[PDB]
Each structure stands twice: as C-alpha cells, then as structure tokens.
C-alpha cells in the first residue's frame, strides 16, 4: 500500500463550567464564523460539583452538556458521536464529520484521578485515543490542582497522568499505550496556572492595557514549561485574549466577592506532533453562564491516509 499527507481541520475546545447547566446556544464556543470542522475534540470542567457525583455517580450534567454541544456544532454537516469519556466533571467528547467515521479505529479512553489523597476525581484528567486513517492521536483533558501556590502539584498532577493512563491495545506482547506514543497529541483542559509576583490591581491594570506579552512573562505555565518540569516537547500558541478566569457569573466583570481572585489564563490547549498548523486560538466573551470563559483552537493536522489503488 502506498500512504500520502492529507489535511484535515481539528477543532480543540476547554471550558470549565462551574458545576451549572448550560444555558447558553454554543455555537458561539463551537461554530462562530469558522469553516465546519472536519474533527471536534470538545472537554469540560467541573460539570457537576455535587457530593454525589464526586462518589462516581451517574449525573444528568452529562447528557445535557453532551446534548448543547451536539447542537452547538457546525450546521453544514452532520457529525457522528465517536467517543464520550467522564471522571466527575471532567468530561470529552468526539465527534467526527459522518463522510470520516469509517476511518475511525482503535477508540480507546481512560481516566486517571489526581484529587483527593491523590487519586480521586476532582482534579485529574481524561483521554481519548484513537486512528484515523493510519495517524495516531491522543487527545487529554485535564483538571489541574486550584490556587496561585500549588504550582508544584499542578506539575506532579501533570506527571501523574502522563505515567498512569494506559490505554488498551490489539497485541498483548507490547506494552500498554501510554499518552506519547501518539503521532499527534492534543492536550486541553484547566490547567489552573496562575500569574506569579505582580499584585491583583496590576494584573488587571495590564489587562485593560492589553499588554498580554508583558502579563505573558509572569505566567506560571510559560516558566514552567521553560524550566522542563512539565509539557516537555509540547507547543502553546501566543495568548492574545485576555485571562479566562475569573468572573463574576452573568458578565464580563472580574470576581467581586471577598476572594476577589487575581485574573488568570487557566484554561489552555497545547500540542505535539508533525504536520500541526494553528489557525486560531481564542476565548468567547459572550458565554457568561460560567465564572471561566470558554477557549478554542482550530488546527490544521496532515493525517497519512492510504492512496486508493485502481
Ligand atoms: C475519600 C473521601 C474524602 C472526602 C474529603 C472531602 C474533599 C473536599 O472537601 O474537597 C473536594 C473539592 C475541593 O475543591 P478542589 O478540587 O480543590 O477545587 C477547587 C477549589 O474549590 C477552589 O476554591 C476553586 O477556585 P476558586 O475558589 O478560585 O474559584 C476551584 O474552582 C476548584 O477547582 O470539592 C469538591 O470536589 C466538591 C465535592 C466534594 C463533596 C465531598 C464532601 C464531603
Ligand atoms: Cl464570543
Ligand atoms: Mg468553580
């Protein structure tokens, strides 16, 4: 057989939804003024902060959420529900364009809990894996621990998933599918780092400049990444809109209860692997159901795919 590069468009989107229902048309998240998308990879936070769902609980939070996604997406096609995976209120969808399901294979997803003694599901994260074509890709959601001093469990929490989550494979001989034996690797989710040193009011004041490269160099993520404790060989986009967290719920304000938490970008995507392009990446103002704002990141991705013999 002979294989070949194709393109095809890969929609990532994180949004940490602070327990509620959605209430929300999520087309303006999934489907605003961008081409249908050939692949959508869609993860959530905190989709249910009950005491019943931490104890690993069925919740309706699932279905309705999975239910405003479905209509959320791209009106020009119809799209196959591939994958669905949750630990809590961690969850990830995938769907694909119903012309592409066939090309589909080895749908495989996991969870790996990193809260509570380690190992329950308030923090952590989930992955589906799976083949299109011949390429092999992995996409992670991950619930990183909360709050600006607890970036070393934030890196812990990050290794954690990377040495626990196996997938399943055809050949019991080799050893199981870790996260990086992937051709492409997605990585989203709230990874809850924080902006180090400056005060609340110059964060904020930065903001309202817009000087996002000088906030830039204060974030914990970028020194992190910098200082290979975390996300070795992954690559994140230039941020040009403003923090995602936090929000007084219904508006645009920053939190104004007794918290009053600093601004943060919380809510990431990166990624590794060849043949990767970002046409976008980007946060939607207009959700206000959440005390986050929702982010995206249109790719274009070269899937090898078999050249048809005649
Ligand atoms: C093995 C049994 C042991 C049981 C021990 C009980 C455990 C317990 O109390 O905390 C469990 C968690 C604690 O929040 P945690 O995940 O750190 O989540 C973060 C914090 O709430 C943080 O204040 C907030 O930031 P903000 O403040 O900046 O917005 C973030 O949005 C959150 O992500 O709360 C929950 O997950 C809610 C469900 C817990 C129910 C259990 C009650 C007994
Ligand atoms: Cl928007
Ligand atoms: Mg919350």
């Given at each position: 057989?002979?294989?070949y590069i194709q393109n095809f468009r890969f929609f990532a989107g994180t949004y940490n939804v602070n327990g509620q229902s959605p209430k929300e048309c999520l087309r303006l998240w999934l489907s605003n003024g961008i081409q249908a998308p050939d692949v959508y990879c869609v993860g959530f936070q905190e989709?249910?902060?009950?005491?019943?769902?931490?104890?690993?609980?069925?919740?309706?939070?699932?279905?309705?959420?999975?239910?405003?996604?479905?209509?959320?997406?791209?009106?020009?096609?119809?799209?196959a529900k591939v994958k669905l995976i949750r630990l809590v209120g961690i969850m990830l969808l995938l769907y694909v364009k119903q012309e592409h399901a066939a090309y589909i294979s080895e749908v495989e997803a996991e969870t790996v809990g990193t809260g509570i003694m380690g190992r329950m599901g308030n923090?952590?994260?989930?992955?589906?894996?799976?083949?299109?074509?011949?390429?092999?890709?992995?996409?992670?959601?991950?619930?990183?621990?909360?709050?600006?001093?607890?970036?070393?469990?934030?890196?812990?929490?990050?290794?954690?998933?990377?040495?626990?989550?196996?997938?399943?494979?055809?050949?019991?001989?080799?050893?199981?599918?870790?996260?990086?034996?992937?051709?492409?690797?997605?990585?989203?989710?709230?990874?809850?780092?924080?902006?180090?040193?400056?005060?609340?009011?110059?964060?904020?004041?930065?903001?309202?400049?817009?000087?996002?490269?000088?906030?830039?160099?204060?974030?914990?993520?970028?020194?992190?990444?910098?200082?290979?404790?975390?996300?070795?060989?992954?690559?994140?986009?230039?941020?040009?809109?403003?923090?995602?967290?936090?929000?007084?719920?219904?508006?645009?304000?920053?939190?104004?209860?007794?918290?009053?938490?600093?601004?943060?970008?919380?809510?990431?995507?990166?990624?590794?692997?060849?043949?990767?392009?970002?046409?976008?990446?980007?946060?939607?103002?207009?959700?206000?159901?959440?005390?986050?704002?929702?982010?995206?990141?249109?790719?274009?991705?070269?899937?090898?795919?078999?050249?048809?013999?005649?």
């Amino acid at each position: 057989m002979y294989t070949y590069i194709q393109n095809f468009r890969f929609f990532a989107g994180t949004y940490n939804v602070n327990g509620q229902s959605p209430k929300e048309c999520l087309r303006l998240w999934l489907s605003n003024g961008i081409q249908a998308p050939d692949v959508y990879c869609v993860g959530f936070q905190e989709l249910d902060l009950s005491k019943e769902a931490f104890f690993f609980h069925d919740t309706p939070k699932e279905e309705e959420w999975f239910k405003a996604v479905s209509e959320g997406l791209h009106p020009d096609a119809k799209y196959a529900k591939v994958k669905l995976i949750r630990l809590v209120g961690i969850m990830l969808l995938l769907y694909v364009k119903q012309e592409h399901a066939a090309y589909i294979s080895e749908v495989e997803a996991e969870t790996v809990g990193t809260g509570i003694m380690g190992r329950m599901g308030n923090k952590g994260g989930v992955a589906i894996r799976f083949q299109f074509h011949n390429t092999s890709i992995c996409v992670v959601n991950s619930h990183l621990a909360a709050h600006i001093e607890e970036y070393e469990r934030r890196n812990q929490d990050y290794k954690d998933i990377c040495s626990r989550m196996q997938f399943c494979q055809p050949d019991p001989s080799l050893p199981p599918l870790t996260i990086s034996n992937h051709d492409v690797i997605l990585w989203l989710g709230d990874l809850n780092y924080r902006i180090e040193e400056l005060d609340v009011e110059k964060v904020k004041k930065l903001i309202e400049e817009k000087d996002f490269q000088m906030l830039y160099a204060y974030d914990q993520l970028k020194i992190q990444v910098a200082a290979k404790t975390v996300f070795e060989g992954f690559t994140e986009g230039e941020l040009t809109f403003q923090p995602t967290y936090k929000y007084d719920t219904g508006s645009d304000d920053w939190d104004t209860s007794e918290k009053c938490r600093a601004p943060a970008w919380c809510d990431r995507i990166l990624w590794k692997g060849k043949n990767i392009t970002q046409l976008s990446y980007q946060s939607h103002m207009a959700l206000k159901t959440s005390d986050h704002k929702p982010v995206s990141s249109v790719f274009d991705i070269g899937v090898r795919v078999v050249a048809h013999h005649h």
